[PDB]
Symmetry: D2
């Protein structure tokens, strides 16, 4: 039976987490690590267990870890966390939670980065990156997901792990087509040999070996910042034939750069602008505007078997 | 393998849909039907099929029904729909879509009501409900979900059906408790014999018999308005011991009132206020304020096995 | 020079406020008062004064009332408030603040109602209105604005008072036209003798006598619920020729029903739907959908001179 | 009498606008211009004038320019614009509109940048800035405001002009204090000699000479990007004693760098996190979390005369 409870929107901000170093650059991305002067995370915790049943059926709170207590638990654990990644932070919380509370059989954790970008400051006359001042970003952010279970024989196993990148909004001004689609009684969409493809991208990847996701050995760790740069680079390089076409080629490229990954999952959305003006005198430019609310979307998983 | 595409946020508004009448009443609710002078729905459509593979791998759009064409299909079918429910509308769209498109093997549909409330006007000497003017509501709304597949032998079969009520936000000012929970090093929440419990509720039900969702026989239909009325009534009658405790009781009342239902599912959130002032002289009143963002949540399925 | 500081989003919820009764009724509305079992308010406070200067220019906080302390002030005063309206609560907060902090020369307050709607419960055999369970509403809400100054001779004076209704969203399915507008090289909008006019309305009114706003003499108070009912009634009654034409008619009706009002200010928007389908066989019905983002807006003040 | 009408959320995206080049650099910023490969803007247009009266009072649309036509006018004008700034674009629209429609006495325009960021693409062997693929940013954006009147002698005069930068969210991890403020019965906030000051900033500036805002002479133009960089630099450099003290010093630096500016206006908000963990073993690190909803705010003008 379905039976879970927990805490969502657990925001937790940590200064001076152990820096993530030793990630090898790939051609698409300069990412080599994170300074972690500021490390923000938004945690959602959810726990399950057959012994929680009376809390529902009888109003018996004896075996109820208050959700407020779970919040305290996550926040103290971020203080005491000695690792370098969100993925590793989740495992640390999950392990430590299951050991503390034996009546809990399953725990599920989501960790969403709260990204901060660097800013410019002048020190004694010269402009450079600040080590004190940071700009909160509302753009793309890394994610992580972990499900941990307590088996009958009293051991703890990770049953599901998934890392990700969310809120990536990319527009390519030209070099995009959508042609040859079904033309029938329901079709009003004109063919377009040259559109400004505007796509929202949620990319998720699973590791062949779960240990690689924690960052303990950084050479095996796949950073969301790297996945971002692959997506932009592939979009640039491709004469896209559709979004479906685009995300296949993005996923192929990710799995080629990262042979430690089993699969790459995509959730895309089409928010492409409507054309108002085709031609301006003496320039190559055009004018576009926002479309009606309806948006296209695609879901697609690319495995190593492709 | 995971392979889907479609269209979201398909808003469609129909005037003068066939009225919902002939429903079976229950003690908790005076719900007697819907006028359907104004019928609003927000439709998400997703389709799959192995024959779509090459639209991704090769960028071959030959068998691609444009997502924009899916929008036209939905809107046109809301015009020609002869029934009386969202659930029934989904089945009309799904069956019709698969019949039109032989290479599509599965279709999933979500439909979310866009509620409107009655307003009143003075005309002809008296104040009376307006047949023309309606107020858009951003409160609770009904939902529907339907998954339909094309089988090997070319029949169409519904594999999943679920109806629902979303966005229900209820506060009970007194007559609630949360005591007896685990007290340890992680616990800073005080025991509370009398709190103003504030809950967000999303409730979803499944029928034993799928045909009962359509409203063709209105007696067997379960209206979201009736479910709303059960929830608010049970909340009032109950000396709550927790949210877990409350949603079980709601779930049981729903299953008792509707024997044609197989199960009920809850997704609740806790948004209870913090107390600022406990005692006002010459008054039973108190002052409260908004809490920090972390919210408690609870997921639970009550089945006929209760 | 502009110099202010303060606190916003000061949420405060009070139970068992003194009920608003003894109101004077109008034909358009059955509004007879407020129970005030649950009273919710969202306050924003701004304060000024030339003596706050050094807190900006020198970093001198000696005369700085902490914005956190302002939040505590408002929340404690909601507990001690013996009145019946948001407008009267603002006066009480304002007067009390300037009396406490002599160095402050001006104070501006905004109060927004946090709506709650009656729910129903089965109890003791019958189905009746609950005194405990309330539904949070995200629809229309009352507002209040007050600006108070400390005069050079130490007395206090209200320089501005303004009450309001916000978030009112109304659609009239028929009996609306928009024709006769300018047709030139920038005009693509077709003339329309029968459209479904959808408006967002923000209505604000000022009293001739400030003290009528407080609700001390309730018969003189103009309730936002009554304004709402006038708006829906006039929209229904009127074959509108534009939104412009409609809001003038609502404003005139307001000033006729409430002669103690000086003026009524409107801030409207046009979110009218796009027609998809005109003809549905054997029914007067039609289908519509959401337009592109650009919305029309209108600003108009009606005074006793009309 | 208040009498206005127009169109909001006019989204307009132009490709290959004339590049902004030759901007006078400052030490705090690298900014030297904009490529304008992609240029997005969100315009709100408002028009007024006494001959519109009958449009409201009688429902006579003879002199009504449809708001939909205003949208067309703005969009078509983005195509024909030969200038290089948002401020210049508003002037071009305003002037052109008043010349075309002689019954209109006044026009007010708001222009909001829709910012796009550069991305990485593998080009000519190594990753470099793509000239095709951009990332939509939901962070800070440039703004502009222009009001223009037709005088009785039929000349067109700019009566108000203001440029801006909105949505800047800055957090400084240390080097911030808030002490010495008033401590009475309403004060619960502890003094803090070391807090992680988190500020939301809206900065607006007016020019001594209006013609400096258009960018026709790029030597005299003040770019939002440069203002952005002055703000992060000054925040870094300053041991802040309050937000009030911070924004004053930010303003001074702006007026010093830009003698062609008459004034700088600030609207700031305090969203500073609550401390959970003050001390972590073997580390200078700390953990924080989101506070309750209430937020402090400051409004302040710095002029050349400070
Ligand atoms: O109803 C509740 N259930 C819980 O699990 C919980 N935890 N803190 N408060 C709570 N309230
Ligand atoms: O890339 C696209 N894929 C689709 O399936 C589609 N339908 N309309 N536009 C589209 N673009
Ligand atoms: O009622 C309206 N007034 C207007 O000014 C307008 N412009 N487009 N549609 C409109 N409708
Ligand atoms: O910078 C600040 N200014 C203020 O006025 C204030 N009040 N609380 N914290 C504050 N911080």
């Amino acid at each position: 039976r379905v039976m879970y409870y927990g805490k969502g929107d657990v925001f937790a901000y940590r200064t001076y987490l152990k820096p993530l170093t030793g990630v090898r650059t790939i051609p698409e991305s300069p990412f080599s690590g994170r300074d972690h002067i500021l490390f923000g995370v938004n945690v959602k915790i959810s726990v399950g267990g057959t012994k929680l049943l009376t809390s529902f059926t009888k109003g018996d709170n004896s075996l109820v870890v208050a959700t407020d207590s779970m919040k305290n638990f996550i926040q103290k654990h971020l203080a005491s966390y000695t690792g370098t990644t969100i993925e590793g932070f989740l495992e640390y919380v999950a392990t430590s939670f299951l050991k503390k509370y034996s009546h809990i059989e399953k725990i599920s954790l989501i960790g969403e980065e709260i990204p901060f970008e660097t800013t410019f400051a002048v020190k004694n006359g010269n402009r450079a990156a600040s080590e004190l001042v940071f700009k909160k970003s509302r753009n793309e952010y890394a994610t992580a997901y972990l499900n941990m279970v307590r088996n009958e024989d009293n051991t703890l196993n990770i049953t599901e792990q998934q890392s990700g990148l969310a809120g990536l909004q990319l527009i390519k001004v030209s070099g995009n087509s959508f042609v040859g689609f079904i033309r029938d009684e329901y079709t009003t969409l004109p063919e377009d040999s040259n559109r400004p493809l505007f796509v929202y991208l949620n990319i998720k990847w699973k590791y062949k070996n779960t240990e690689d996701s924690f960052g303990t050995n950084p050479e095996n760790y796949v950073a969301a910042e790297q996945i971002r740069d692959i997506a932009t680079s592939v979009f640039h390089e491709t004469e896209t034939l559709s979004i479906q076409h685009l995300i296949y080629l993005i996923g192929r490229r990710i799995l080629e750069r990262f042979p430690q990954l089993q699969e790459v999952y995509f959730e895309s959305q089409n928010h492409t602008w409507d054309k108002i003006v085709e031609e301006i005198p003496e320039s190559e430019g055009k004018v576009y505007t926002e479309p009606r609310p309806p948006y296209g979307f695609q879901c697609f998983t690319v495995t190593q078997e492709d």
